[PDB]
Structure formats: structure tokens, C-alpha cells
Amino acid sequence: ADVPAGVQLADKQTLVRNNGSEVQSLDPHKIEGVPESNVSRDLFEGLLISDVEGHPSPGVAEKWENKDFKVWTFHLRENAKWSDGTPVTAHDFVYSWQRLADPNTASPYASYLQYGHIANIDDIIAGKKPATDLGVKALDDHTFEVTLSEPVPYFYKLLVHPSVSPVPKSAVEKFGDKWTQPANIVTNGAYKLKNWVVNERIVLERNPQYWDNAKTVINQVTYLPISSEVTDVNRYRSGEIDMTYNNMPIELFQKLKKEIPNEVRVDPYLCTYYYEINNQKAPFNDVRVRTALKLALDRDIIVNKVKNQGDLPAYSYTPPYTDGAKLVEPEWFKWSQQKRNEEAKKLLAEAGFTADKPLTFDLLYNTSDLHKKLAIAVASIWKKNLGVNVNLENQEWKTFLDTRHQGTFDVARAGWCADYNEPTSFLNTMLSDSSNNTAHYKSPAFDKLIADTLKVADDTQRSELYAKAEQQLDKDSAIVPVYYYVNARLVKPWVGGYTGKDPLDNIYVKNLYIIKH
Numbered sequence: 072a073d074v075p076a077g078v079q080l081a082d083k084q085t086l087v088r089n090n091g092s093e094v095q096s097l098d099p100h101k102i103e104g105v106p107e108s109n110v111s112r113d114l115f116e117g118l119l120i121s122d123v124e125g126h127p128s129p130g131v132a133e134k135w136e137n138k139d140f141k142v143w144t145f146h147l148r149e150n151a152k153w154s155d156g157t158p159v160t161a162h163d164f165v166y167s168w169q170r171l172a173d174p175n176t177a178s179p180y181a182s183y184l185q186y187g188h189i190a191n192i193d194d195i196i197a198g199k200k201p202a203t204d205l206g207v208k209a210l211d212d213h214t215f216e217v218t219l220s221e222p223v224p225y226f227y228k229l230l231v232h233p234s235v236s237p238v239p240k241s242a243v244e245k246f247g248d249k250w251t252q253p254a255n256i257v258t259n260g261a262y263k264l265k266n267w268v269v270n271e272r273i274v275l276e277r278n279p280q281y282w283d284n285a286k287t288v289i290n291q292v293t294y295l296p297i298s299s300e301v302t303d304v305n306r307y308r309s310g311e312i313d314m315t316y317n318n319m320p321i322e323l324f325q326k327l328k329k330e331i332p333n334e335v336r337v338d339p340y341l342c343t344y345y346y347e348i349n350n351q352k353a354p355f356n357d358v359r360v361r362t363a364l365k366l367a368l369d370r371d372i373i374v375n376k377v378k379n380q381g382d383l384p385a386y387s388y389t390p391p392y393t394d395g396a397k398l399v400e401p402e403w404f405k406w407s408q409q410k411r412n413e414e415a416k417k418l419l420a421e422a423g424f425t426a427d428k429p430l431t432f433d434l435l436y437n438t439s440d441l442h443k444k445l446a447i448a449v450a451s452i453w454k455k456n457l458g459v460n461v462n463l464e465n466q467e468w469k470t471f472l473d474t475r476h477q478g479t480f481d482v483a484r485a486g487w488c489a490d491y492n493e494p495t496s497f498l499n500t501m502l503s504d505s506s507n508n509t510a511h512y513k514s515p516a517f518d519k520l521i522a523d524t525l526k527v528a529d530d531t532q533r534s535e536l537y538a539k540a541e542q543q544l545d546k547d548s549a550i551v552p553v554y555y556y557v558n559a560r561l562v563k564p565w566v567g568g569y570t571g572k573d574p575l576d577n578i579y580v581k582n583l584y585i586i587k588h
């Protein structure tokens with residue numbers, strides 16, 4: 072952390088953060104969500120990290136070069152160490168990226184190596200070549216070299232994500248799935264795991280072997296698993312919580328902005344809220360049905376009437392303010408809602424649905440005040456505007472994500488936040504073979520457009536292709552875009568170091584500090 076001249080620090084440097092839900096895992100290769108990555112940034116550090124404003128910056132690698140954007144060479148700092156005192160080496164990254172690629176690991180982020188185009192990843196994922204053929208090598212203990220199959224000028228931007236953080240081979244091998252228990256885990260971030268009580272708390276303590284430990288100020292941070300945004304706000308105002316999770320409750324937010332304005336942080340956020348349709352299951356495999364649901368949802372009622380927290384009505388998957396997005400707003404988004412209703416009713420009538428044989432399906436959401444209130448409103452809107460019936464179902468976070476991967480669903484509430492600021496961080500998740508494709512959407516036209524983006528060496532051609540990829544997605548109604556999120560949360564006045572400037576919200580507790588209060 073960089074404490075400004077003249078700030079007086081509190082004697083006690085501890086922090087309590089709400090983290091939305093119980094994490095899926097602490098293993099960097101078994102996680103895919105925001106709650107998981109929030110904890111992962113404090114424990115595992117990859118080649119690069121985001122600085123306090125979000126820019127990709129030196130992590131374990133102090134410096135790097137590229138040759139034609141295809142061969143990337145990372146110079147690892149000599150004093151990078153794990154929490155057991157042993158050196159972090161390039162061999163750790165070799166093992167780790169191979170373990171990520173290996174289909175036996177079944178990482179939800181195996182395709183992150185396809186997004187970066189690391190040599191031989193397609194055959195490794197498909198079981199055609201062993202994971203040891205991946206295009207990564209340690210040239211020595213402090214030099215990691217990555218070979219890609221085509222130029223990727225933004226490749227380094229991907230490297231702050233948890234999936235490309237190192238994992239300790241000796242602990243993994245000796246302890247299997249219990250390697251992340253407090254008695255066994257070994258970490259190389261600013262913190263180490265002290266306690267992990269499922270559905271209660273995760274407590275981290277400063278890691279004295281961290282190479283940048285002298286700049287770490289917070290000695291202990293606790294992450295809570297509270298999925299009720301009302302409860303999070305309540306335990307923040309009670310004094311227990313220093314920073315809420317960034318999902319705000321419909322019940323209290325308006326009150327909160329008038330009662331504690333200076334604690335209500337509202338910043339740009341590269342995330343999109345949408346209803347994910349299971350594209351492989353009838354009758355959601357019919358484009359007319361998917362289009363009807365997309366058009367009959369009234370975004371203005373949701374965004375400005377039921378939620379009203381500063382979100383913007385959405386018409387695409389990739390947020391329009393992503394670096395490199397130059398999207399074309401479709402004609403349906405400019406129409407009146409009445410005009411969207413008739414078209415939707417028209418397509419569902421065309422699809423074979425009637426008053427006596429209506430469309431009825433499940434709407435799955437992860438346990439939450441916010442998601443439940445939005446799903447009830449969406450259910451009412453769809454019933455009123457399109458005559459469709461929905462049965463709401465809540466599931467805890469970890470189970471909810473597995474359901475979506477399994478495809479044991481009809482429609483699910485969903486949110487994707489960028490992992491790097493470039494349109495492919497969204498668009499690659501809709502590729503036919505992506506491990507993050509929970510829409511179960513498979514379009515050869517869409518896949519071709521994205522494949523074409525690294526075959527040109529021109530940013531405008533690339534942007535035009537991302538725009539056309541969004542149009543292909545829209546044309547097929549793969550999803551139901553709802554709104555682009557704002558990053559809204561409460562932060563106590565004594566928490567220093569959180570700018571709100573990073574649109575990816577890649578917070579590191581090593582950058583924060585507690586002001587005397």
C-alpha cells in the first residue's frame with residue numbers, strides 16, 4: 072500500500088470484507104467467480120498484477136519482452152517466495168499452466184489458455200497431446216517463456232487472472248483436494264490462509280515471505296460469505312463489516328445514498344447482467360422463443376424502476392465501454408416497449424404457443440436479495456408482456472455454477488465481468504468449445520468472426536469484427552441482455568487505498584490501509 076504523507080494509521084490494521092457467497096474453492100484452477108477471485112488475489116500472485124488503478128503491472132515478473140507478440144519472455148524477480156520460504160520459480164509457472172490445460176483438472180478456465188493462444192492448447196484440451204506439450208518453458212529458474220500460435224498484442228493483459236497464478240506442486244501432489252486446507256496450503260501472495268470455516272468466514276494473515284511485504288499494511292483480512300445484500304449492509308452499519316460486497320439491496324439503497332453518501336461508492340464496472348438461456352435445450356433451441364424473451368423484457372422498468380442504482384439498459388454482451396468496443400446498437404433497442412411486445416408475442420405465437428399451451432419454464436438464480444427481487448420483477452414483466460409462466464428457483468453460488476455447466480437448466484440469471492479489458496474477454500466465452508460457455512451456444516459463424524480477429528493486425532478491423540460478433544450473438548438471441556453494471560458498494564471512511572478507478576475491480580488487500588478513527 073502507499074500511505075499518503077500525514078495520514079495517521081490505526082493501531083490495529085485489520086479489515087473485514089463481505090464476499091457475497093461461500094467460495095467454490097481456493098484452488099486457482101477450480102474457480103471462476105468474483106468471490107473466488109477476490110480471495111485468490113490476496114493469496115496467489117501471477118506474472119503480472121493490477122496496480123491500484125487497475126493497470127497491468129509487475130507481479131512475480133519484474134520485467135518482460137515480446138517478439139512479434141508471439142514469444143513472451145518474463146523475467147521473474149529473484150526474491151519472489153512462497154509462504155514456506157521457498158523460491159517462486161519459472162518451473163512453478165510451467166507446472167501450473169500445464170495443470171490448468173490438463174483435462175483431468177477439469178478447470179472451468181482451461182480455455183483461458185486458448186484465449187491467449189498458447190501453443191498446442193487445442194490438442195491438449197482435446198486429449199490429443201499431453202499437457203507437457205504446452206508452449207511454456209522455464210529457460211532458467213527466473214525466466215518463464217511463453218510461445219503463442221499467433222500474435223496477441225494484448226496477451227500480457229490476461230496475466231493478472233487467478234487461472235494463470237502459480238500453485239505449489241508439492242502440496243497439490245501430497246494432499247490432493249485438501250491441499251488448500253490451512254494446515255497444508257502454501258501461498259505466494261501478500262497473505263496466507265489462517266482460518267477457513269465453511270459458510271462462516273475465511274481469515275487471511277499477512278505473509279512475511281511475500282517479496283513486497285514491507286509495503287503491506289493490513290495484517291489480517293476476513294472474507295465473509297453473506298449472500299443477503301440486506302444483511303451485508305446491516306452488518307456494515309453495525310460496525311462489523313468494513314467493505315460490503317458489491318451487490319446492493321433494492322430495499323435499502325435509496326435510503327443509503329441519502330443517509331451515508333460519502334460511503335456509497337459507485338464506479339464504472341465492466342460487467343453485464345443478463346438472463347442466460349440454455350441454448351441446447353428445447354424449446355430454448357428455437358430462436359423465436361429466445362428472441363421473444365429478449366424483446367419482451369422491459370429494461371427501462373428493471374433498470375430505472377425496480378433497481379434504480381445507476382445501471383444502463385443493455386443490448387449486447389460485451390459492455391460498450393470495454394477498451395476496443397465500437398458496438399452497433401440494434402434497431403430493436405430503439406423501439407418502444409409496446410413494439411417489442413407485439414413482435415415477441417408474434418414470434419411465440421409463431422413458435423406454437425397458445426393460451427391453453429403456454430410457455431412455462433424455470434428461472435434459476437443464485438441465492439440473493441437482489442437477484443430474487445429482479446427475478447420476481449422479470450417473471451411479472453414476462454407474464455404481463457408475453458403471457459409466459461416462470462418458476463423461480465434459488466441455489467447457493469457453488470451449486471448454481473455447477474448447474475449451469477451441467478446444462479441442468481432452462482434460463483438462469485447471470486453476470487460476466489471482464490478478466491482483461493478487451494472485447495474478447497467477453498466474446499471468447501461464447502465460442503463453441505469454451506470452458507466458460509454456460510449458454511451452451513455453438514455458432515460456427517460466431518466462432519469464425521472471433522478467429523478472424525487475430526488474423527488481421529489492424530485495430531479497426533478487429534473492432535469491426537467484435538461488433539459483427541455481437542451482431543451474430545444478437546441475431547441468434549443467445550442471451551437476454553439486461554443491464555451493464557455499475558460497481559456499487561459501501562466502504563467505511565477509514566478504509567484508505569480503494570480508488571474505484573479500476574473498471575475490473577481487481578482489489579488487493581495489500582494496497583489498503585486503516586486510517587485512525
Ligand SMILES: [U]
Nearest residue numbers: 080081082083
Ligand atoms: U491502541
Ligand SMILES: [U]
Nearest residue numbers: 223224225530
Ligand atoms: U498497443
Ligand SMILES: [U]
Nearest residue numbers: 393394395492
Ligand atoms: U488501451
Ligand SMILES: [U]
Nearest residue numbers: 432433480481
Ligand atoms: U424446466
Ligand SMILES: [U]
Nearest residue numbers: 301322440441
Ligand atoms: U428481503
Ligand SMILES: [U]
Nearest residue numbers: 224528529530
Ligand atoms: U496495436
Ligand SMILES: [U]
Nearest residue numbers: 081586587588
Ligand atoms: U476509536
Ligand SMILES: [U]
Nearest residue numbers: 081082083588
Ligand atoms: U480503539
